[PDB]
Amino acid sequence: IQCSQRMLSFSDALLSIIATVMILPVTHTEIDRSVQRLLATRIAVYLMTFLIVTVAWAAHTRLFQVVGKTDDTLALLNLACMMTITFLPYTFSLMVTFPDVPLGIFLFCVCVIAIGVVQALIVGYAFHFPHLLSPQIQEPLSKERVEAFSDGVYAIVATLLILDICEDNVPDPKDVKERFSGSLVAALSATGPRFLAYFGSFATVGLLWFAHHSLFLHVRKATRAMGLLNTLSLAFVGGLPLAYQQTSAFARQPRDELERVRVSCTIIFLASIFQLAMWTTALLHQAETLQPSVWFGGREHVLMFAKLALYPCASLLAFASTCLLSRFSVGIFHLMQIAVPCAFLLLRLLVGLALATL
């Protein structure tokens, strides 16, 4: 018998890697009609493979909620399960790209059966040894597994763009001599747009997590509904690097710039509206879901509501500005990107002043 905490922590460390695998082809597309069609299908494949893996992760979370502890043999079998799930993103992509060929669906079916067989072995082993079962066995989701998966997914998504910078955007000496007259600074400057995208992408996904971090500190017990929205929250957060990378790219006409800013704001709203939904959904059954410091009329109630609702409000103002002003919108988008971090920093005083004003 062994404590299962770490074995699972590693388990979600792999899944977050696998779930977000298909985002990499999305962000690596190079910038028209054919590109748009290609970009759409890549995005569609990403969302599908994210949910499929998430269901497999969900089954694992439930499966190991029964097996309270772990031993040497189960750890080996657990690895075989994870080794089995790592094929879903590839197998699915083959299936969609090849709907006519029956081989594609067969591989997809084989993989799903393989995951089931390994899990069937895992549960069988546990029953054969009652001391490996949870005391209850000897709806709610485990909170740690939701936390650990979320932390991973954000870390990959936050740092996607830099990994591309560290690899493909390191100047090569020969080009420096030829196309930059031997000036290193010029070579770095030509890469400046790509560096701004990373700064914005990290700041957004860096703060979106901060709202998530403070939300789940006061959550007593997650629920299936909260987990499902959380999955939808993270699914869209994966598109943020794509959004920012598009915004910083050169625009031939002002209409091109406006359209991209509309696209970028849409994903930020979708990513953070569901975090607000989780708060509201918890409020419905707050008696059994949240700490008593965030109940209706509680001390932190007003603070938490604002903290989650800032991005939904900020994004709508940016989107509304695009529709109405049509000329200062780009400045507002950049201005808000610099203002939102300040609002998060001064949230305590800002809300207190507002309460006095009201």
Next chain:
Amino acid sequence: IQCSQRMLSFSDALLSIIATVMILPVTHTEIDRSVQRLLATRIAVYLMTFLIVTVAWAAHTRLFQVVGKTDDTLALLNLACMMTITFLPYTFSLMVTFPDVPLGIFLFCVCVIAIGVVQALIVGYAFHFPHLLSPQIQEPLSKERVEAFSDGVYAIVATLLILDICEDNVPDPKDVKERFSGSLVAALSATGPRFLAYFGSFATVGLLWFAHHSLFLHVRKATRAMGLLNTLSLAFVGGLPLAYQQTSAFARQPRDELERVRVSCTIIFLASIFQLAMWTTALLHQAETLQPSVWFGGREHVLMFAKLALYPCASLLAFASTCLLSRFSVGIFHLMQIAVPCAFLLLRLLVGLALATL
């Protein structure tokens, strides 16, 4: 005040992603003298940046051992620190690639100073509010931080090859029609060498984690020496995806097959020998570093040593057979790969049989 357990775990998720960033160029190198020189420098940079980032991570662990708890302001500041450290891999690569130009060294000095001031702010903020410091203040490394970083590193390292397969090696419908006569099976079969690389890489990297996980469950209190040896163990584990990719590559002459097996066996020995070194180092101060269940003469003592010493001992035989046999060497390596997982599965039975014989 807030519990920092989740906040730190996120920082270790970011750092593990950052430390092993430079391994991606290493494994993307395509297969002669120039390539050897190009491959050597890439491996040299990867080893350096891993040590630099781990040095940054080591400071982070010590810093936040003084900041016991956290609140809203600290969480934002911690994010600032991560934003700064995510540039060390890129800035260092710029410095090395351009030793002559003084700009590169200036950026590296700037980035390092940036981390210093941000940490200076955090320590200053905590001292301003005594209640946010640890009770002791208001050498040993925190165990959880060592595990979280280690689990991340194995997760990225284990799945490195698959993320490349899901992205680069999905058959092209037009190519299948042209270069494979429209037979999907032919296209997938041409990909077979790449898949066998992933099978071994996951198992070898996967089973190394299982040995690592078993060790760190029985350790009371990590130590600086253990942390340093752990860092070296992870640094070489990053080379396993490279090793198995080379072995599976087509060989023009048998001597090439022999050379690749020597390198592949070497990396496994270096990766696993240091995990044995951690065990040996801990035993020196067993009274204050390990469970009594793994002391000299303990119930599990013999079992643990076999589990860690399996790969170091198994690897030498694969290398030894290379020099002596020279014709069954390649066969032995393949058989050994299918043999070690069985030995790990049946370790408890195998050790019992050996004890009875002795």
